Design an enzyme around this catalytic site. Structure first.
Site, mmCIF file in Angstrom:
data_model
loop_
_atom_site.group_PDB
_atom_site.id
_atom_site.type_symbol
_atom_site.label_atom_id
_atom_site.label_comp_id
_atom_site.label_asym_id
_atom_site.label_seq_id
_atom_site.Cartn_x
_atom_site.Cartn_y
_atom_site.Cartn_z
ATOM 1 N N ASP A 59 -3.881 -13.257 3.740
ATOM 2 C CA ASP A 59 -5.148 -12.797 4.280
ATOM 3 C C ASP A 59 -6.372 -13.196 3.460
ATOM 4 O O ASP A 59 -7.481 -12.897 3.878
ATOM 5 C CB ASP A 59 -5.137 -11.306 4.642
ATOM 6 C CG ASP A 59 -4.488 -10.428 3.614
ATOM 7 O OD1 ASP A 59 -4.192 -10.888 2.484
ATOM 8 O OD2 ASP A 59 -4.313 -9.235 3.956
ATOM 9 N N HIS A 105 -6.029 -7.725 -0.282
ATOM 10 C CA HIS A 105 -6.181 -6.297 -0.552
ATOM 11 C C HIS A 105 -5.427 -5.894 -1.835
ATOM 12 O O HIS A 105 -4.386 -6.444 -2.169
ATOM 13 C CB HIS A 105 -5.623 -5.453 0.607
ATOM 14 C CG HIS A 105 -6.242 -5.746 1.931
ATOM 15 N ND1 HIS A 105 -5.726 -6.669 2.820
ATOM 16 C CD2 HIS A 105 -7.388 -5.276 2.478
ATOM 17 C CE1 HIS A 105 -6.520 -6.707 3.886
ATOM 18 N NE2 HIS A 105 -7.534 -5.878 3.693
ATOM 19 N N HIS A 160 0.818 -1.214 0.000
ATOM 20 C CA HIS A 160 0.000 0.000 0.000
ATOM 21 C C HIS A 160 0.853 1.266 0.000
ATOM 22 O O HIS A 160 0.331 2.361 -0.171
ATOM 23 C CB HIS A 160 -0.939 0.066 1.203
ATOM 24 C CG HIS A 160 -1.932 -1.050 1.254
ATOM 25 N ND1 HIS A 160 -2.847 -1.293 0.248
ATOM 26 C CD2 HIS A 160 -2.157 -1.990 2.202
ATOM 27 C CE1 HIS A 160 -3.577 -2.346 0.573
ATOM 28 N NE2 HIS A 160 -3.186 -2.780 1.757
ATOM 29 N N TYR A 164 -3.343 -12.443 8.906
ATOM 30 C CA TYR A 164 -3.512 -12.087 10.315
ATOM 31 C C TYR A 164 -3.952 -13.221 11.233
ATOM 32 O O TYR A 164 -3.973 -13.040 12.438
ATOM 33 C CB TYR A 164 -4.461 -10.868 10.421
ATOM 34 C CG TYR A 164 -3.931 -9.764 9.554
ATOM 35 C CD1 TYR A 164 -2.809 -9.046 9.947
ATOM 36 C CD2 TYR A 164 -4.426 -9.550 8.277
ATOM 37 C CE1 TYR A 164 -2.248 -8.088 9.126
ATOM 38 C CE2 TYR A 164 -3.876 -8.590 7.460
ATOM 39 C CZ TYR A 164 -2.775 -7.871 7.885
ATOM 40 O OH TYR A 164 -2.182 -6.916 7.092
ATOM 41 N N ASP A 222 -2.251 -11.180 -1.943
ATOM 42 C CA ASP A 222 -2.853 -10.581 -0.756
ATOM 43 C C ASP A 222 -4.312 -10.194 -1.099
ATOM 44 O O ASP A 222 -4.604 -9.816 -2.228
ATOM 45 C CB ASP A 222 -1.999 -9.374 -0.347
ATOM 46 C CG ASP A 222 -2.431 -8.755 0.976
ATOM 47 O OD1 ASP A 222 -3.522 -8.140 1.018
ATOM 48 O OD2 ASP A 222 -1.714 -8.895 1.974
HETATM 49 O O1 LIG Z 1 -3.350 -6.614 4.814
HETATM 50 C C1 LIG Z 1 -3.365 -5.416 4.564
HETATM 51 C C2 LIG Z 1 -3.746 -4.379 5.595
HETATM 52 C C3 LIG Z 1 -4.444 -3.182 4.989
HETATM 53 C C4 LIG Z 1 -4.958 -2.260 6.073
HETATM 54 C C5 LIG Z 1 -6.396 -2.607 6.438
HETATM 55 C C6 LIG Z 1 -7.060 -1.383 7.035
HETATM 56 C C7 LIG Z 1 -8.544 -1.635 7.262
HETATM 57 C C8 LIG Z 1 -8.744 -2.723 8.292
HETATM 58 O O2 LIG Z 1 -9.217 -3.802 7.970
HETATM 59 N N1 LIG Z 1 -8.348 -2.386 9.514
HETATM 60 C C9 LIG Z 1 -8.388 -3.166 10.688
HETATM 61 C C10 LIG Z 1 -9.217 -4.280 10.867
HETATM 62 C C11 LIG Z 1 -9.217 -4.979 12.064
HETATM 63 C C12 LIG Z 1 -8.412 -4.563 13.106
HETATM 64 C C13 LIG Z 1 -7.578 -3.467 12.942
HETATM 65 C C14 LIG Z 1 -7.582 -2.765 11.741
HETATM 66 N N2 LIG Z 1 -3.034 -4.993 3.367
HETATM 67 O O3 LIG Z 1 -2.723 -5.923 2.406
HETATM 68 K K LIG Z 2 -3.784 -8.289 -4.083
HETATM 69 ZN ZN LIG Z 3 -3.807 -7.597 2.947
#
Ligand SMILES: O=C(CCCCCCC(=O)Nc1ccccc1)NO
Ligand SMILES: [K+]
Ligand SMILES: [Zn+2]
Ligand SMILES: [Cl-]
Ligand SMILES: [Cl-]
Ligand SMILES: [Cl-]
Ligand SMILES: [K+]
Ligand SMILES: [Mg+2]
Length: 357
Positions: free
Chosen positions: A264, A173, A133, A304, A171
Site C-alpha cells: 500500500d 501503515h 494491526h 489495495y 506496509d
Molecule cells: O492496510 C491496512 C488497513 C488499515 C485499515 C485502514 C482504516 C482506515 C481507512 O483507510 N479506511 C478505508 C479507506 C477507504 C475505504 C475503506 C476504508 N493496514 O496495513
Molecule cells: K509499516
Molecule cells: Zn496497510
C-alpha cells in the site's frame, strides 16, 4: 526449488457482506497469484500447502478471550456479525473470517517451517486477511490475528526461544499490534516504515512515532520510521534502508527475517498515497536477502490497487528466486521531511546500536 510459495483460494471466502466494494477484497490474493502464473514465477517455486493455525498456536500472541470471540463469529447470523464487527476499529466479519485468519497464519507457519528445516531458502505467502494491526486482545484495521507476530513465535517454538527474528514492516501503515506484542522483547526486532502525518494517518496513534523505542529489555528493539508531509517513494525508502534498517539489522544479526509486506506504499494505492515502484520493492527485498543467510519470508499485509500489488509482490518473488536486482538512483534528493524523519530515528536509536554511532 529454493523459494517456497503458499496460496490457498479458500482465503478468498472472507468478505464484506455490507460493502462488496470495500478495498480489502477477496481478489487481492487471486490477482497476485494470477500474476505469478502470467510471469511464470509459480512453477519456479516449491508449493507449500496452507493449513489452519490451531487455537494453541494463536495463544502464542493472543488472549483466550480474543480467540474465543473471533471463533464465535463462525456461525453467527448476519445481524450479529455486523454488531460484532462494529465493536472494533475498521473490521468487517463474515462467517468465513475466522477460518480465513487461521489459514493465513497456518500458511505462514508452514512457510517458516519450510525455511527453518532447510526445505526452502526463502518464501512468499499470499494470504489474507492481514495481521499487523491485531493486538493480543483485539482485532483492528482489517486484521484478526497477528500473522507475522505469531509466525515469529512459531519459529522460536521449533528452534530456540531466543531465536533472533527481524520483522520488517513496509506496509504504509504502522503495525501497532506487532509493536505491542514485542515491545518488551529483545529477541524480536520490529522495524516499521509508515506514513504517520503526526497522527492523522491510520492507526492515528502516537505509538507510531520515532520516540517509541521499546520497553525494558526491549529498549532499542522497536524502530519506527514515520513519514510526514511528503509523497514518499523509492528514494526515501532506499535512504531509510541505507541509514537505518540495514545497519541496525546487520548488528542484530537475525536468524530469520519476516517481512510484513503490505504493498500500500505503492504507486497507485488509494489508501497509501505514496509512490514506491515495483523495482523499489525488489531493491528492498534484495537488501533483506543479505541477512539471516537468506532466510526471508514475505507475508502479504495491505495493498489495495490490484494491478500494483500484483506486480509489486511478483517482483519480490523474482528477487527471492535469484533474479538480477534493479539499479536505482541513490542520488535523487529526498523530500525534505524525509530527511527530518530519518534524522529523528537516528537520534532515537543511536543509544542502542553501535552501528549508528
Ligand atoms: O492496510 C491496512 C488497513 C488499515 C485499515 C485502514 C482504516 C482506515 C481507512 O483507510 N479506511 C478505508 C479507506 C477507504 C475505504 C475503506 C476504508 N493496514 O496495513
Ligand atoms: K509499516
Ligand atoms: Zn496497510
Ligand atoms: Cl508483462
Ligand atoms: Cl508458472
Ligand atoms: Cl529528534
Ligand atoms: K521488540
Ligand atoms: Mg540494541
Amino acid at each position: 526449488p529454493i523459494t517456497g510459495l503458499v496460496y490457498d483460494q479458500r482465503m478468498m471466502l472472507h468478505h464484506n457482506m455490507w460493502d462488496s466494494h470495500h478495498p480489502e477484497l477477496p481478489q487481492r490474493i487471486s490477482r497476485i497469484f494470477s500474476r505469478h502464473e502470467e510471469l511464470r514465477l509459480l512453477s519456479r517455486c516449491h508449493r507449500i500447502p496452507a493449513r489452519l493455525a490451531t487455537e494453541e498456536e494463536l495463544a502464542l500472541c493472543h488472549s483466550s478471550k480474543h480467540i474465543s470471540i473471533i471463533k464465535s463469529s463462525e456461525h453467527m447470523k448476519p445481524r450479529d456479525l455486523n454488531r460484532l464487527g462494529d465493536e472494533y476499529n475498521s473490521i468487517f466479519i463474515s462467517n468465513e473470517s475466522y477460518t480465513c485468519a487461521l489459514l493465513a497464519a497456518g500458511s505462514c507457519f508452514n512457510s517458516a517451517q519450510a525455511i527453518l528445516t532447510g526445505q526452502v531458502r526463502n518464501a512468499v505467502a499470499i494470504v489474507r486477511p492481514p495481521g499487523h494491526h491485531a493486538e493480543k486482545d483485539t482485532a483492528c484495521g482489517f486484521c484478526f490475528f497477528n500473522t507475522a507476530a505469531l509466525t515469529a513465535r512459531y519459529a522460536q517454538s521449533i528452534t530456540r526461544e531466543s531465536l533472533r527474528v527481524l520483522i520488517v514492516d513496509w506496509d504504509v501503515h504502522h503495525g501497532n499490534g506487532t509493536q505491542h506484542i514485542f515491545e518488551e522483547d529483545d529477541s524480536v526486532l520490529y522495524i516499521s516504515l509508515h506514513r504517520y502525518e503526526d497522527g492523522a494517518f491510520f492507526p492515528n496513534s502516537e505509538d507510531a512515532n520515532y520516540d517509541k523505542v521499546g520497553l525494558g529489555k526491549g529498549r532499542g528493539y522497536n524502530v519506527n520510521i514515520p513519514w510526514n508531509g511528503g509523497k514518499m517513494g523509492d528514494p526515501e525508502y532506499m535512504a531509510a534502508f541505507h541509514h537505518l534498517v540495514m545497519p541496525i539489522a546487520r548488528e542484530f544479526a537475525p536468524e530469520l527475517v519476516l517481512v510484513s509486506a503490505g504493498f500500500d506504499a505503492a504507486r497507485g494505492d488509494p489508501l497509501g498515497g505514496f509512490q514506491v515502484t515495483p523495482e523499489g520493492y525488489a531493491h528492498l527485498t534484495h537488501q533483506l536477502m543479505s541477512l539471516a543467510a537468506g532466510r526471508v519470508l514475505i507475508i502479504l499485509e495491505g495493498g489495495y490497487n490490484l494491478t500494483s500489488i500484483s506486480e509489486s509482490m511478483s517482483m519480490c518473488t523474482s528477487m527471492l528466486l535469484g533474479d538480477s536486482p534493479p539499479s536505482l538512483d541513490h542520488l535523487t534528493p529526498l523530500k525534505t521531511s524525509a530527511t527530518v524523519s530519518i534524522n529523528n530515528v537516528l537520534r532515537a536509536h543511536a543509544p542502542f546500536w553501535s552501528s549508528l554511532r
